[PDB]
């Protein structure tokens, strides 16, 4: 509950989501790691499917939409405590992909959270608890996605 929630806040320091530059690139440098390390996800974006790290790196676009979601990350274990607005902003996140025809299998859903681990990994050192609490936010929004 409230320790999950606790643990996963605190590595989230280590990812802006505010103004600065460093934020910008924090964005950017989740669309490398998955770009370059899950190349099968690129295909759900549009005409930059064949992109490299590199390619990411330059195109204004995953400064915005890493921001978009590492904001999301930050939401989803701000709300774990209140399971009524953790599902609920899980079903929206949904909503919201498909708005735009991104569908996606269910068990992408669950390949995120090994890819955003991994990521938070290099931005900062993980231990078990902390690592145990991202498992289970990740556990609990991959079944609410799969509804
Ligand atoms: C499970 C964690 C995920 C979160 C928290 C997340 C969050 C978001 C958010 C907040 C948006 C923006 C929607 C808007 O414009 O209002 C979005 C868009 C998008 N997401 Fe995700 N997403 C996740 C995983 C994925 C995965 C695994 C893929 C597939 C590679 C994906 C592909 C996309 C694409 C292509 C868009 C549309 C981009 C555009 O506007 O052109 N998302 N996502």
Redesign the pocket.
């Given at each position: 509950a409230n320790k999950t929630r606790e643990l996963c806040m605190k590595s989230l320091e280590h990812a802006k989501v505010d103004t600065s530059n460093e934020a910008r690139q924090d964005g950017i440098d989740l669309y490398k790691h998955?770009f370059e390390n899950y190349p099968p996800?690129?295909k759900?974006?549009?005409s930059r499917e064949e992109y490299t790290a590199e390619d990411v790196q330059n195109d204004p676009f995953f400064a915005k939409?890493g921001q978009?979601?590492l904001?999301?990350?930050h939401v989803?274990c701000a709300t774990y405590d209140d399971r009524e607005t953790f599902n609920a902003y899980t079903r929206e996140?949904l909503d919201?992909?498909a708005?735009?025809h991104?569908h996606?299998p269910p068990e992408?859903?669950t390949?995120?959270?090994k890819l955003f681990e991994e990521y938070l990994g290099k931005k900062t050192t993980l231990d078990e608890p902390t690592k145990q609490a991202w498992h289970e936010i990740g556990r609990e929004?991959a079944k609410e996605i799969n509804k």
């Open positions: 998955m996800l690129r759900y974006f549009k939409q978009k979601i904001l999301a990350c989803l996140l919201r992909h708005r735009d991104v996606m992408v859903w390949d995120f959270w929004f």
